[PDB]
Write an enzyme that holds these catalytic residues in place. Structure first.
Site, mmCIF file in Angstrom:
data_model
loop_
_atom_site.group_PDB
_atom_site.id
_atom_site.type_symbol
_atom_site.label_atom_id
_atom_site.label_comp_id
_atom_site.label_asym_id
_atom_site.label_seq_id
_atom_site.Cartn_x
_atom_site.Cartn_y
_atom_site.Cartn_z
ATOM 1 N N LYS A 1 -0.042 58.837 -64.576
ATOM 2 C CA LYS A 1 -0.051 57.845 -65.656
ATOM 3 C C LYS A 1 -0.594 56.470 -65.258
ATOM 4 O O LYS A 1 -1.556 55.969 -65.846
ATOM 5 C CB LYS A 1 1.352 57.676 -66.240
ATOM 6 N N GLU B 1 8.950 49.426 -64.657
ATOM 7 C CA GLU B 1 8.250 50.092 -63.564
ATOM 8 C C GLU B 1 8.305 49.282 -62.261
ATOM 9 O O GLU B 1 9.187 48.430 -62.092
ATOM 10 C CB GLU B 1 6.825 50.516 -63.958
ATOM 11 N N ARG B 2 7.385 49.563 -61.339
ATOM 12 C CA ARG B 2 7.460 49.009 -59.984
ATOM 13 C C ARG B 2 6.991 47.563 -59.875
ATOM 14 O O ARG B 2 5.848 47.242 -60.213
ATOM 15 C CB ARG B 2 6.657 49.871 -59.013
HETATM 16 N N1 LIG Z 1 -6.755 60.252 -61.137
HETATM 17 C C1 LIG Z 1 -6.226 60.743 -59.995
HETATM 18 N N2 LIG Z 1 -6.960 61.415 -59.073
HETATM 19 C C2 LIG Z 1 -6.413 61.902 -57.936
HETATM 20 N N3 LIG Z 1 -5.113 61.771 -57.625
HETATM 21 C C3 LIG Z 1 -4.273 61.113 -58.464
HETATM 22 C C4 LIG Z 1 -4.795 60.551 -59.721
HETATM 23 N N4 LIG Z 1 -3.780 59.969 -60.365
HETATM 24 C C5 LIG Z 1 -2.688 60.136 -59.583
HETATM 25 N N5 LIG Z 1 -2.972 60.824 -58.454
HETATM 26 C C6 LIG Z 1 -2.021 61.179 -57.363
HETATM 27 O O1 LIG Z 1 -0.678 61.195 -57.848
HETATM 28 C C7 LIG Z 1 0.023 60.011 -57.442
HETATM 29 C C8 LIG Z 1 0.816 59.429 -58.604
HETATM 30 O O2 LIG Z 1 -0.055 58.837 -59.555
HETATM 31 P P1 LIG Z 1 0.483 57.675 -60.518
HETATM 32 O O3 LIG Z 1 -0.735 57.126 -61.197
HETATM 33 O O4 LIG Z 1 1.420 56.740 -59.783
HETATM 34 O O5 LIG Z 1 1.346 58.460 -61.633
HETATM 35 P P2 LIG Z 1 2.649 57.859 -62.388
HETATM 36 O O6 LIG Z 1 2.975 58.856 -63.466
HETATM 37 O O7 LIG Z 1 2.490 56.394 -62.749
HETATM 38 N N6 LIG Z 1 3.957 57.912 -61.246
HETATM 39 P P3 LIG Z 1 5.542 57.413 -61.755
HETATM 40 O O8 LIG Z 1 5.420 56.216 -62.669
HETATM 41 O O9 LIG Z 1 6.185 57.140 -60.418
HETATM 42 O O10 LIG Z 1 6.077 58.632 -62.461
HETATM 43 C C9 LIG Z 1 -1.045 59.086 -56.873
HETATM 44 O O11 LIG Z 1 -0.538 58.195 -55.874
HETATM 45 C C10 LIG Z 1 -2.049 60.077 -56.325
HETATM 46 O O12 LIG Z 1 -1.607 60.654 -55.092
HETATM 47 MG MG LIG Z 2 3.863 54.732 -62.350
#
Ligand SMILES: Nc1ncnc2c1ncn2[C@@H]1O[C@H](COP(=O)(O)OP(=O)(O)NP(=O)(O)O)[C@@H](O)[C@H]1O
Ligand SMILES: [Mg+2]
Ligand SMILES: Nc1ncnc2c1ncn2[C@@H]1O[C@H](COP(=O)(O)OP(=O)(O)NP(=O)(O)O)[C@@H](O)[C@H]1O
Ligand SMILES: Nc1ncnc2c1ncn2[C@@H]1O[C@H](COP(=O)(O)OP(=O)(O)NP(=O)(O)O)[C@@H](O)[C@H]1O
Ligand SMILES: [Mg+2]
Ligand SMILES: [Mg+2]
Lengths: 53, 483, 469, 484
Positions: free
Chosen positions: C157, C183-184
């Site tokens: 996300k 969030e963070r």
């Molecule tokens: N577009 C992408 N391409 C490749 N790897 C990715 C991508 N997006 C996320 N990842 C991998 O997955 C991890 C988590 O992505 P992130 O964008 O932080 O998702 P998120 O849903 O915000 N996490 P959270 O808020 O903790 O549930 C990243 O640190 C990467 O290791």
């Molecule tokens: Mg996040």
């Protein structure tokens, strides 16, 4: 020979089928043991709420 | 007896005590009861105070005197807490006497905001061939250790601490990592036997154990990780580097559910209260790397979560996964077989520790990360063909799988690691039997230490691999492999 | 001579204040308590009777004493509105948290406002080209529309929002608003330092974005209200400045979650799952304010946490209807290394219609969705019995879905550290022309891995020659 | 005296507890001194529990609340046509005062056992799959049910869009007036919908009753009932209304919010004990009246939304209990190309052929049962086997009949257009045609008949049935076009 080639491809495809069907039974045994608990917990929350008022 | 300063107990059951008076009490103030047991003022009402006990209810009767403290729930902090074992209220339980404290931080402290931070860049060195190559942890990061029951979860945290001995004897003030190990709901013996393991390895001297064990009242267990954070924060606040291990937040969340249900809060998902995400979030947010404008001090959290039967989609696993900066996921299926650390690579990630990887690891572990997650590709579809093309991958993979296997309490220096991963990545093991890969390491590292200590000293000093030093690593490995 | 009350009761974020005079503060008014540090802000939520009001605190209530004097500001929490907010970082309560002095703006509007009327609705149909293939091909976002990114823990996300920012924000013309919610703190610091190092924020000149943070270290009061602050600022640009406004919320779930942390302390009988009975209406009040009106336009991207990867949870469940385009991120997809981990089939646009995108675009999108679906309908059999028990027609359509599946993965510019690949950005027309051909079966001879993590059509050809020898 | 007026004792969350109001009736409208209106649902000894139809922000303890003397109601009459109003009927299109023939209360009794007649009239929807397989009659309650984004509204909407065929004529008995109730939808979607309605010139015979996502839950709760009352005016006066309740899921949810905040002890999934009655009494109002009552009809098309295709969930089970059948829509089928995404094996119309133009009934003989045969077969085919002639013949026919029933949105079809395509399908004339050409076959064949055999389509539209003279002509026509 073709027939014996087949009988040895069939006991292989089915060997790999049981080995893979059992992998899904691991997924669905755990998800079940989960969904079963979740069901019971949510009916129980309903009961507790209904029992405060 | 003041009604403002003093109180009488109205009722006591289910961990709560109701007190009349205490008219000058603060929200979240510690109190002392007749018997010595302490509590916290949770809910403040017209005509009574709700107090959560830090011990057995047996310890509080109706009609009892309760004295104010003036103090919000807090602990002693400072450097005087190294080599100590306190309980959640910072009370010394190792029998080593009074805690020598620089002062008293609160239990609930706010996390440094957007401004006072910098990105992570410094290595927390675990000495674990799998972690440091594939899931590098930065100083200020929050990396979750997650896995089933008995999968070497604690082992990763512990061997990380025993690896700090390396710099925690040195003069350089900045590469020192002071530790905090938090025991939540563990057995009293496990924690005593764990200390003894920090003692034997001479690690206890730079670490702090905070323990709220299996038998202790829930709010003590609930409280333990927070009062551990403040203890840790001191180092972060005073230009030093503390590592905090929450072992584990599963059990804390369980303690917190008890507290919540006894308090009659609406139970949600898996009967956890609405605010269980928040419980952890405010905790793990207190790990940070600070900006040089704030003294550059760094707190680093390695929380432990216990999944049930490998399911990471459970409520508490997904909450903390969405707080932390990555997960080292350890797998029951791997651990059963021998691959220990059982770091399931595919399902493991560091989100910020990228910058924090020692270059020499990053160099010999170049896309080892994404190869191993892809040796996993063929290895799950070869159990279908005898392909010559895809058999070198299955023999790089298999050798590398044995290369990252590790004994416990055996953490390794950076310099000891890079040549092991060179011998793997570049294929120098392909002819060597599988059952001798473990004998290769021990023979090889001796051969390295006895002859090529010039190369080994140099990796340590730079943190880089010069094209000269890589053209030499080639000669020493080929020479030993032939004999 | 101000309007004073005294604190009667304190539980968590909930503070009961008694008012000696019969003039009681209105619901939604900010009240104040002088502390030893600064000022604690309470918002009035309900009138309990017997001259007492119930309030929600905007910060920790540690130290509060029964008796404490309480001020009535005689108004809802305000926030600085205007251009003097750009490049500044802001509290839930408006205060500037970037140390850089006071936001010297000319006005201060309440964070609670009534959503635009039905008469004031301005409907359009205009594609917002994101450059991300899956979006532009199967679920195109809408300028002035509402965009939600559903995903569980760590599926993609934030990185997705980050590419959205990086792609569309930098050169947009209008003003952006980013609001972090539950969030963070680290991610905020990361984004702040980013916008300085990309010229979107300029400390020593003009700026494009306004920053509002209420993260997961904050009490549920802040986490409940901060989304409205961010919003109010975005409304001034829309209304009093005609501006096309980019609003970014991450994460919108944390606002509902926040509100479910107080609900019981506010004395409510819980609804399904523990949530506040007001979950849909609290969402209506917030969402229905993010909207393109006749005066101005508000394109917004919102991240939606899905708890325990459960899309049916009352929260994200309820969020779906508020959105013009949804893209759902799937763990099962992400665990295959496909990124963005976008679900090509469970993601939806209002604008996937031949009138908007062109008949060709539509036809190609549909045939792609058809292909993927046929593979997905055959998963149980592929898994147990394998490819060899399919009919050859299916075996062919499967082999082609497998390729499209990979061809939807794309290297992001911000994800450059996890892929180790220059972040490609593909134009909508190119995407359309590339997939059309793959459907015609022109590239069947090409192994799958060539389609993986590339750009348009030519990049697959480039990878195919690269891999053979 | 505290009879006609009362004082607020406490307030918040859109609920007000009022002292006094000693002569207030259960369910009466009240007015707060601050301007906001409300409704008394709890009459207890000490006090009156009141839900507000707006904000509470301006209400205060001690404030003065006033009886209206009236059980909640709405303006009704042909004056509402082409208009958009709120739950209590207030004009929200900003086009000034509605003119009302009269005022029905919100909660009306349904017509009893006696004042009714068997549904015998088509509500021609103009969608091939609906009109042929699951035909809807005037007075029926037909449920549209599916997951989000499966095409539920599109079914209701295409139906409204189709009535233009008759609503433009002099003849009133055939005319069908449309009420679209928006509940929990957001304002921009309701806007976008009226905008689509004007483009087809369908708004003129419509009324939008909209209680949107930001509005007070009791407004959302009330909307479908007042809309029922607005719809009833037609029925009660020998005209015909179609009412779309989009959607009853969101309504139940408001009803839940309203009740929990009133502190009424919750039931299953926190819903109110009587959440079934909520819909049962709503939907019973939709009826076909007897001759003695002027033959007016109210046809309901309620919408329900499921989660993960769970039609066993609480509310969907309630509503399935109530209606005369349902149309089931499935994402799985939508992505296979099948649009409308109707699950033919699960959808039914209890009214049945009884309310279906004979022309279409005749050509769609056992079409639904054959499509059932087609389903079982394409499952015997799945496990890898080439079969015999007859079995692969029904495998060919059903694959094309399916394709024939695919249909663009905002493209409802006239009966006389539908009968030919179906006839052509069921009788084998499409078996010779390659599958990916059935769409282009349809429109060409249509245009061929309009120019050349206009005779027939004029006759089918006129006589409603099919004489053997029209069957022989059609057989001779279709076979002719097949050989381009
Ligand atoms: N577009 C992408 N391409 C490749 N790897 C990715 C991508 N997006 C996320 N990842 C991998 O997955 C991890 C988590 O992505 P992130 O964008 O932080 O998702 P998120 O849903 O915000 N996490 P959270 O808020 O903790 O549930 C990243 O640190 C990467 O290791
Ligand atoms: Mg996040
Ligand atoms: N690298 C290793 N090699 C061999 N054995 C190991 C290794 N790491 C841990 N173990 C052993 O495996 C067992 C369980 O490991 P442990 O570190 O206790 O995991 P855990 O997740 O803490 N289990 P628990 O705390 O009981 O849920 C212990 O006997 C460890 O000593
Ligand atoms: N016959 C059709 N052929 C192709 N597409 C269609 C058809 N009918 C509807 N759609 C499209 O399918 C999408 C969703 O349909 P919609 O009519 O909104 O169903 P819904 O279930 O009401 N969705 P929502 O209200 O958001 O839960 C829209 O993009 C429609 O334009
Ligand atoms: Mg352990
Ligand atoms: Mg709809």
């Amino acid at each position: 020979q073709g027939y014996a080639a087949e009988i040895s491809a069939r006991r292989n495809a089915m060997d790999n089928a049981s080995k893979n069907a059992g992998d899904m039974i691991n997924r669905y045994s755990i998800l079940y043991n989960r969904t079963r608990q979740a069901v019971i917990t949510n009916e129980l929350v309903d009961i507790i709420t209904g029992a405060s008022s | 007896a003041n009604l403002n300063e003093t109180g009488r107990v109205l009722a006591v059951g289910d961990g709560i005590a109701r007190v009349f008076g205490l008219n000058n009490i603060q929200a979240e103030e510690l109190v002392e009861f007749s018997s010595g047991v302490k509590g916290m003022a949770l809910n403040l009402e017209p005509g009574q105070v709700g107090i959560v006990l830090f011990g057995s209810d047996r310890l509080v009767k109706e009609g009892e005197l309760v004295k104010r403290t003036g103090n919000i729930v807090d602990v002693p902090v400072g450097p005087g807490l190294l080599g100590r074992v306190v309980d959640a209220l910072g009370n010394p339980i190792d029998g080593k006497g009074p805690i020598d404290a620089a002062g008293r931080s609160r239990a609930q402290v706010k996390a440094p905001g957007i401004l006072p931070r910098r990105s992570v860049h410094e290595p927390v060195q675990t000495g674990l061939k799998a972690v440091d190559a594939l899931v590098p942890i930065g100083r200020g990061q929050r990396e979750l250790i997650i896995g089933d029951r008995q999968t070497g979860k604690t082992a990763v945290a512990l061997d990380t601490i025993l690896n700090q001995k390396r710099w925690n004897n040195g003069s350089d003030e900045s590469k020192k990592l002071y530790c905090v190990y938090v025991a939540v709901g563990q057995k009293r013996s496990t924690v005593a036997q764990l200390v003894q393991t920090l003692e034997q390895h001479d690690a206890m001297k730079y670490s702090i154990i905070v323990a709220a064990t299996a038998s202790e009242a829930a709010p003590l267990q609930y409280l333990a990780p927070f009062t551990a954070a403040s203890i840790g924060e001191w180092f972060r606040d005073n230009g030093k580097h503390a590592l905090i291990v929450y072992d584990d937040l599963s059990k804390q969340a369980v303690a917190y559910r008890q507290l919540s249900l006894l308090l009659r809060r609406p139970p949600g998902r898996e009967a956890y209260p609405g605010d269980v995400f928040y419980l952890h979030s405010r905790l793990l947010e207190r790990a940070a790397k600070l900006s040089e404008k704030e003294g550059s001090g760094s707190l680093t959290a390695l929380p432990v979560i216990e999944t049930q039967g490998g399911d990471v989609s459970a409520y508490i696993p997904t909450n903390v996964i969405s707080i932390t900066d990555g997960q080292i996921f350890l797998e029951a299926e791997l651990f059963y077989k021998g691959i220990r650390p059982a770091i399931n690579v595919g399902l493991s990630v560091s989100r910020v520790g990228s910058a924090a990887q020692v270059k020499a690891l990053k160099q010999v572990a170049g896309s080892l990360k994404l190869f191993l997650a892809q040796y996993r590709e063929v290895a799950a579809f070869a159990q279908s063909d005898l392909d010559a093309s895809t058999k070198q991958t299955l023999v790089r993979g298999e050798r590398l799988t044995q290369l990252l296997k590790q004994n416990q309490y055996s953490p390794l220096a950076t310099e000891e690691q890079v040549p092991l991963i060179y011998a793997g990545v570049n294929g120098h093991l392909d002819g060597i039997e599988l059952s001798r890969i473990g004998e290769f390491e021990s023979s090889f590292l001796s051969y390295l230490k006895s002859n090529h200590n010039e190369l080994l000293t140099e990796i340590r000093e730079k943190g880089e691999l010069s094209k000269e030093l890589l053209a030499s690593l080639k000669s020493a490995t080929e020479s030993f492999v032939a004999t | 001579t101000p309007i004073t009350g005294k604190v009667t009761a304190v539980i968590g974020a909930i503070v009961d204040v008694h008012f000696e005079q019969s003039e009681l503060p209105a619901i939604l008014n900010a009240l104040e308590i002088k502390t030893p540090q600064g000022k604690l802000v309470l918002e009035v939520a309900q009138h309990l009777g017997e001259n007492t009001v119930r309030t929600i605190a905007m910060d920790g209530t540690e130290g509060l004493v029964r008796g404490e004097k309480v001020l009535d500001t005689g108004g809802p929490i305000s926030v600085p509105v205007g251009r003097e907010t750009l490049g500044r970082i802001i509290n839930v309560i408006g205060e500037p948290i970037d140390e850089r002095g006071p936001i010297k703006s000319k006005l201060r509007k309440p964070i609670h406002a009534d959503p635009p009327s039905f008469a004031e609705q301005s409907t359009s149909a205009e594609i917002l080209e994101t450059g991300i293939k899956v979006v532009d091909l199967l679920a195109p976002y809408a300028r002035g529309g509402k965009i939600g990114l559903f995903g569980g823990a760590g599926v993609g996300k934030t990185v997705f929002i980050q590419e959205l920012i990086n792609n569309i924000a930098k050169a947009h013309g209008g003003f952006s608003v980013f609001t972090g919610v539950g969030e963070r703190t680290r991610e905020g610091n990361d984004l702040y330092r980013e916008m300085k190092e990309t010229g979107v924020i300029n400390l020593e000149g003009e700026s494009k974005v306004a920053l509002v943070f209420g993260q997961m270290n904050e009490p549920p009061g802040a986490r409940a209200r901060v989304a409205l602050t961010g919003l109010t600022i975005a409304e001034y640009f829309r209304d009093e400045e005609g501006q096309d406004v980019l609003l970014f919320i991450d994460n919108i779930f944390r606002f509902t979650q926040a509100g479910s942390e107080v609900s019981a302390l506010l004395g409510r009988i819980p609804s399904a799952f523990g949530y506040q009975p007001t979950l849909a209406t609290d969402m209506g009040l917030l969402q229905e304010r993010i909207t393109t009106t006749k005066k101005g336009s508000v394109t917004s991207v919102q991240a939606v946490y899905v708890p325990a990867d459960d899309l049916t949870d009352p929260a994200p469940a309820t969020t779906f209807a508020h959105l013009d385009a949804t893209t759902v991120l799937s763990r099962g997809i992400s665990e295959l290394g496909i990124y963005p981990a976008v679900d090509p089939l469970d993601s939806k646009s209002r604008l996937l219609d031949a009138a908007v995108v062109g008949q060709e675009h539509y036809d190609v999108a549909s045939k792609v969705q058809e292909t993927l679906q046929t593979y997905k309908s055959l998963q149980d059999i592929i898994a147990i019995l394998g490819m060899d028990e399919l009919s050859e027609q299916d075996k062919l359509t499967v082999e082609r879905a497998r390729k499209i599946q990979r061809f939807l993965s794309q290297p992001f510019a911000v994800a450059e550290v996890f892929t180790g690949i220059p972040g490609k950005l593909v134009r909508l027309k190119d995407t359309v022309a590339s997939f059309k051909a793959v459907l015609e079966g022109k590239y069947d001879n090409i192994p799958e891995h060539a389609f993986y993590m590339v750009g348009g059509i030519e990049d697959v050809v480039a990878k195919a020659e690269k891999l053979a020898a």
